[PDB]
Design a protein around this ligand. Structure first.
Ligand code: SF4
Ligand code: SF4
Ligand code: SF4
Ligand code: SF4
Ligand code: SF4
Ligand code: FES
Ligand code: FES
Ligand code: FES
Ligand code: FES
Ligand code: 3NI
Lengths: 235, 425, 152, 54, 277, 152
């Protein structure tokens, strides 16, 4: 009979729309979650050279432009049929790890840290990155530093931070000279400290709201991932 | 009615397939006069001081043009007759090659003698399936009278007058594109220099002049200088044929002498307007020309008095348009003809005219704004100032002029949602 | 297929070794064959030793050449200044929506073809809608059916 | 063909919004904290909806 | 006097008599925006971006085609010329579909350099989104026609420099497209010697060498070493671009020599591919 | 494409729920459309709830049905006993080698079609070569050109 809309769903990427269709008594008949944007990256590309795809496909997202870059690169490397070189493997994995770090830093500290810290009933003016910089001046700066670490790796490897070009079809365009390698390695004792402090903070949040947060949208489903021999591989 | 016709004075009267009637009309006696008694420099200074303002749409002292054409270093000059019409409603060159197929032949023989040319061409459109056979009959029946061959009139002179059927393109209306279509190649205006009168057809000199301007050459030496002078005003000199058509009473070639008041050109010569509703505009130069409306009545139509008004008197395609025809509509029409008849070399005439067509189609539909009008004006001025040959340099005249004479009208199509001709809102 | 290889190879004979002459060399294969097939242009480029790209550029640069088979009856409407101010655009668009074919192409089975021309000369009797044989002086919106069924 | 990250989690997000709605219903007055929880189920996966809809 | 003296933008310039204004311009130092002048290929006057104004004469004339006449005052930069050049660039961007995000030549495009120079933060003219074909049938060259300014520098470099006259223009007006033989694809063409001189002449990323796309950019080069091709006796002069220990693009200098920079397939396609063996 | 879906769906209306009637139901779509397209047979099978295989079998079993577009002028030569003993086979083979098309098919652009028929009735004036309008009584080997150019 009638429905509620949370359009636009904020502090996520893209365009979303949660509709909650209620009954006549005011109880939830059903909810759905729409994505209200579409561009057509499966119909753009018909006609284009495959080498154009590791530059077209990063434009599907800016939080993960290197993920699409590297997937398109592996697709075109299987189109060519190349080995590929171990140095290329490790450089692509370095760019992918930098992207993992920056995307998870943005996902925790920028988008999901307000609810985790100030609670789901906090005022709307404070629930953002801005009120987080205001009230928690060190945690927002630490998250910014972690995101900057990831994007400095991505920028060092592929010129730009967002939509980088570092992986050609067949290999990798640019290696790492020792100066910038040492520069990236000299910040890892600090970035690991940032990550472990965030781990402790989220473990105290989950341990505080003991059983309620353990049934907060917890449904039993299947778990797809990538694996080495028995390990957790991300590339 | 009264028009003082001297260029197509004979036209229909003389049977085109009969040369003997034309020479009976004192026709080729000029050729004789020139080849026997008149030394070349004498006919040169004659046509020069005759003030024959070139009727090839641009306006020029063709005596000076031939003066340029002679001094070119070479021995294989040419003379061409651009017998195609710019305006695709103009049938002047059509009617002149139909009526008097020999005037042009006689004029080009004279001019080829003057400039020292042997080979010559006549580029008439192949889409005129009757002018071609009349001209070919004229060329044959003049071949047998020792008029185009070895030692014409026994004078140590050679002249072969070819006939090239036009492949149907207004782009090949300028000099360098005509010269490209005659060499059997895409009609693409090369930038001058190399100039056409110095490095034209096949790298040899060339003397492209209008078919009407060629047809005036027989009457330069048969009569004399002052004869051609004694027709009107002093700045421009001579007489122009006009394909008066449109919506008045009766179309047809109306060859008025000189700058004569537009009132006694359209109001009473054609005679009122169809269904007697007072006209709102007139195109005086075709698509390469501008519009005149309700203010240029007591104005001489001579070449100097209207280039400042903004409408080069190009190949006399005057079309009258009363209030039942929209000005934005005819602006789109002329610009659409221009877009369809253009090579595609210059970035201004290929894209400018496309975007101006789009903006005019958007103003006609009412979907336009005020920034649309400013963009249309600025793009028009840019395409006029930057285009290469002169088709595009005069392509946005049916916009520019219709901006300086129907501005409010333009505003009335966008600010208010109205149009005199209720075809589409 | 073999009918289009010597007719084009014979009309080029009086032009061999002469500068120029691709505009006429085509106006002849157009008048004979009705159109300029790809085989025609290929043999012209072979015989004149002119580039195929140049031949195709000249063949597609000028309006009166048709690279596809033109119809057996052209429907030339006049989009000249005199006809357009009279309203020939209406006649053009109705023959458009009536034959259902695009602006400057042939019918699906080669019966008609719409070819907007310049002034056919009857700038007095405007608008003119020539149907490949003779002029047609008035051509109001209703008189288009009584001719398009007749010539087919 | 691009099979992207948020696509596989679309059903988990739909069912999660269903479960967090079906525990925080009010007949009227539709508060803002329950809206923040309905948004936080989505923000748990933090989805790039641009990738999902290529 | 052969040595004529003019004044371009106040700066005095010296040139030979027959030289065009662009020649006396590029001879001393001064910069005039050009898109269709390839040093070598005869000045083609299509882009109309090099327009300069003579003092007193209120009209504007191309500097690539108009000759230098014995003393005159040429103004290259002012408000009206900047406006007209920005309008020309915007017409090019609005007519053809130009997406720089994914263009191999985004850093080399001469339409992009001019646009950024003239601060083109817009298109102004309505975007005609028409469908121009992407001819990538050739495994070595790709012709993405929605970036084609129509400068004929590819027709001219395949007509007067290579000779295997593969490219010419197709239709008139707006429908004018650059085509191979009989309007076919580049792979279907019998007369392409697969030279790449069409890719060295194209300023606007239409024609690109596929195998070295996004790497053979001149802006992202680590070094530029001039040398000689060692594959054949002609010993063409080359301008090899080096990006991280590999040659990414071999463009041939010698546009003034009779060859004209048209290195062959073995030189524009085996020399950079051999640095990755 | 939409012109062939309701015309066939309307001629089937007076046959719904009546046993039989596929031979007539087709002789009507033949007289209207000139031929039986695959869309026509498909809609006949849908409307009558008769198998598509049966419809195609009946459509290809009888001679006077044509599944492809027939020409705009049929060239029915008589291969009857009276004409054949007179020598109509000669006339048939020369119209064959003259149109250059196979025995029972249409020209490449839908102008003519050769359809060897049974006795057209003029078994006195033999051989008869009907050219879709009228009889033709004598038709010696030389009189075939003067008609095949006329009707085209
Ligand atoms: S202005 Fe340019 S595009 Fe137009 S006809 Fe002249 S050269 Fe061709
Ligand atoms: S050709 Fe140049 S201007 Fe066009 S999209 Fe590519 S980089 Fe941009
Ligand atoms: S590869 Fe060489 S021959 Fe082929 S089109 Fe390009 S320049 Fe011409
Ligand atoms: S393909 Fe390139 S070089 Fe050729 S005309 Fe187009 S823009 Fe110019
Ligand atoms: S570029 Fe080609 S032709 Fe030139 S020297 Fe090298 S191999 Fe020889
Ligand atoms: S111009 Fe479109 S209706 Fe007036
Ligand atoms: S105006 Fe259409 S015939 Fe000249
Ligand atoms: S740059 Fe001078 S016109 Fe192309
Ligand atoms: S025998 Fe041929 S008509 Fe009966
Ligand atoms: Ni994403």
């Amino acid at each position: 009979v009638f429905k509620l809309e949370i359009n636009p769903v904020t502090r996520i990427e893209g365009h979303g729309k949660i509709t909650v269709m209620l009954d006549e008594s005011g109880h939830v008949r059903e909810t759905r979650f729409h994505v209200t944007q579409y561009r057509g990256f499966e119909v753009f590309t018909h006609g284009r050279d495959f080498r154009e795809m590791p530059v077209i496909t990063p434009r599907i997202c800016g939080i993960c432009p290197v993920s699409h870059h590297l997937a398109s690169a592996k697709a075109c490397d299987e189109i060519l049929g190349v080995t590929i070189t171990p140095a290329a493997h490790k450089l692509r994995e370095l760019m992918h790890m930098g992207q993992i770090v920056q995307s998870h830093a943005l996902s925790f500290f920028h988008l999901s840290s307000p609810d985790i810290l100030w609670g789901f009933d906090a005022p709307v003016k404070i629930r953002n990155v801005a009120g987080l910089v205001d009230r928690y001046p060190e945690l927002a700066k630490k998250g910014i530093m972690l995101r900057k670490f990831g994007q400095e790796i991505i920028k060092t490897l592929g010129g730009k931070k967002i939509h980088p070009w570092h992986s050609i079809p067949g290999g990798v365009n640019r290696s790492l000279t020792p100066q910038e390698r040492d520069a990236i390695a000299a910040q890892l004792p600090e970035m690991k400290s940032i990550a472990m402090e965030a781990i402790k903070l989220i473990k105290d949040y989950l341990q505080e709201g003991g059983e309620e947060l353990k049934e907060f949208a917890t449904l039993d489903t299947a778990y797809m991932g990538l694996v080495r021999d028995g390990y957790l591989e991300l590339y | 009615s009264k028009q003082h016709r001297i260029v197509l004075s004979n036209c229909g009267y003389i049977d085109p397939e009969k040369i003997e009637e034309y020479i009976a009309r004192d026709g080729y006696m000029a050729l004789g006069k020139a080849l026997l008694e008149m030394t070349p420099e004498e006919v040169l200074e004659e046509v020069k001081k005759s003030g024959l303002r070139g009727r090839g749409g641009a306006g020029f002292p063709t005596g000076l043009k031939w003066e340029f054409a002679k001094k070119a270093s070479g021995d294989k000059k040419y003379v061409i007759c651009n017998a195609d019409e710019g305006d695709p409603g103009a049938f002047m060159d059509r009617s002149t090659l139909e009526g008097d197929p020999h005037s042009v032949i006689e004029g080009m023989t004279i001019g080829a003698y003057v400039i020292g040319a042997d080979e010559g061409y006549i580029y008439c459109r192949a889409e005129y399936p009757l002018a071609i056979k009349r001209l070919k009959i004229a060329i044959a029946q003049a071949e047998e009278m020792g008029l185009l061959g070895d030692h014409i009139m026994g004078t140590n002179f050679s002249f072969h007058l070819h006939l090239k059927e036009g492949a149907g393109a207004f782009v090949c209306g300028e000099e360098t594109a005509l010269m490209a279509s005659i060499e059997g190649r895409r009609g693409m205006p090369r930038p001058r220099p190399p100039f056409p009168a110095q490095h034209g057809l096949w790298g040899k000199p060339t003397n492209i002049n209008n078919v009407e301007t060629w047809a005036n050459v027989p009457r330069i030496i048969l009569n004399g200088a002052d004869w051609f002078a004694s027709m009107g005003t002093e700045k421009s000199k001579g007489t122009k044929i006009f394909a008066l058509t449109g919506k008045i009473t009766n179309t047809g070639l109306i060859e008025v002498p000189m700058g004569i008041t537009i009132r006694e050109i359209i109001y009473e010569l054609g005679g009122g307007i169809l269904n007697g509703k007072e006209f709102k505009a007139v195109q005086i130069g075709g698509p390469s020309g501008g519009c005149l409306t309700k203010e240029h009545l007591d104005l001489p139509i001579d070449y100097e008095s209207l280039t400042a008004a903004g409408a080069i008197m190009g190949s006399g395609g005057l079309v009258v348009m009363d209030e039942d025809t929209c000005m934005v509509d005819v602006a789109k029409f002329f610009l659409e003809f221009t877009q369809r008849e253009s090579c595609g070399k210059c970035v201004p005439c290929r894209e400018g005219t496309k975007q101006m067509l789009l903006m005019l189609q958007k103003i006609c539909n009412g979907e336009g704004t005020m920034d649309d009008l400013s963009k249309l004006e600025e793009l028009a001025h840019m395409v006029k100032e930057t285009s290469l040959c002169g088709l595009g340099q005069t392509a946005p005249n049916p916009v520019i002029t219709t901006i300086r004479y129907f501005r409010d009208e333009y505003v009335a199509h966008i600010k208010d949602k109205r149009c005199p001709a209720k075809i589409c809102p | 297929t073999v009918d289009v290889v010597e007719k084009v190879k014979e009309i080029v004979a009086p032009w061999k070794g002469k500068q120029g002459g691709l505009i006429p060399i085509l106006q002849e294969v157009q008048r004979e064959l009705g159109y300029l097939p790809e085989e025609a242009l290929l043999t012209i480029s072979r015989e004149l030793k002119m580039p195929k790209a140049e031949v195709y550029g000249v063949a597609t640069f000028y309006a009166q050449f048709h690279l596809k088979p033109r119809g057996r009856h052209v429907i030339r409407v006049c989009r000249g200044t005199a006809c357009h101010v009279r309203g020939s655009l209406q006649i053009l668009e109705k023959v458009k929506q009536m034959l259902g074919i695009e602006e400057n192409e042939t019918t699906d089975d080669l019966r008609f073809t719409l070819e907007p021309v310049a002034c056919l000369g009857a700038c007095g009797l405007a608008p003119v809608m020539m149907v490949d044989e003779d002029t047609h002086g008035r051509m109001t919106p209703d008189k288009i059916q009584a001719i398009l069924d007749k010539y087919q | 063909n691009l099979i992207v990250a948020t696509g596989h989690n679309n059903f988990a997000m739909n069912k999660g919004v269903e479960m967090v709605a079906k525990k925080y219903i009010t007949g009227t007055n539709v508060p803002e904290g329950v809206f923040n929880r309905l948004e936080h189920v989505i923000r748990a996966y933090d989805p790039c909806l641009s990738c999902s809809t290529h | 006097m052969k040595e004529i003296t003019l004044t371009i933008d106040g700066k005095v310039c010296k040139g030979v008599q027959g030289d065009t204004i662009l020649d006396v311009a590029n001879k001393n130092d001064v910069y005039i925006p050009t898109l269709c002048y390839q040093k070598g290929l005869t000045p083609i006057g299509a882009c109309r971006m090099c327009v300069v104004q003579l003092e007193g004469n209120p009209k504007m004339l191309p500097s690539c085609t108009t000759p230098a006449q014995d003393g005159m005052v040429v103004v290259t930069k002012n408000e009206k010329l900047k406006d007209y050049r920005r309008q020309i660039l915007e017409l090019l961007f609005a007519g053809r579909n130009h997406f720089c995000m994914y263009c191999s030549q985004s850093g080399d495009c001469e339409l992009q350099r001019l646009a950024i120079e003239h601060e083109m933060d817009s298109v102004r003219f309505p975007y005609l989104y028409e469908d121009f074909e992407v001819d990538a049938t050739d495994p070595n060259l790709m012709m993405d026609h929605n970036r084609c300014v129509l400068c004929q520098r590819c027709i001219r470099t395949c007509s007067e420099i290579v000779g295997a006259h593969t490219l010419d223009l197709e239709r008139r007006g707006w429908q004018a497209k650059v085509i191979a033989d009989l309007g076919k694809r580049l792979r279907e063409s019998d007369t392409c010697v697969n030279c790449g001189a069409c890719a060295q002449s194209c300023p606007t990323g239409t024609i690109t060498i596929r195998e070295f796309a996004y790497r053979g950019r001149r802006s992202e080069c680590d070094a530029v070493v001039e040398s000689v091709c060692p594959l054949c006796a002609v010993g063409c002069k080359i301008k090899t671009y080096v990006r991280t220990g590999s040659i990414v693009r071999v463009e041939g200098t010698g546009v003034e020599e009779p060859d004209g920079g048209q290195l062959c397939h073995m030189g524009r396609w085996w020399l950079p591919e051999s640095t990755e063996r």
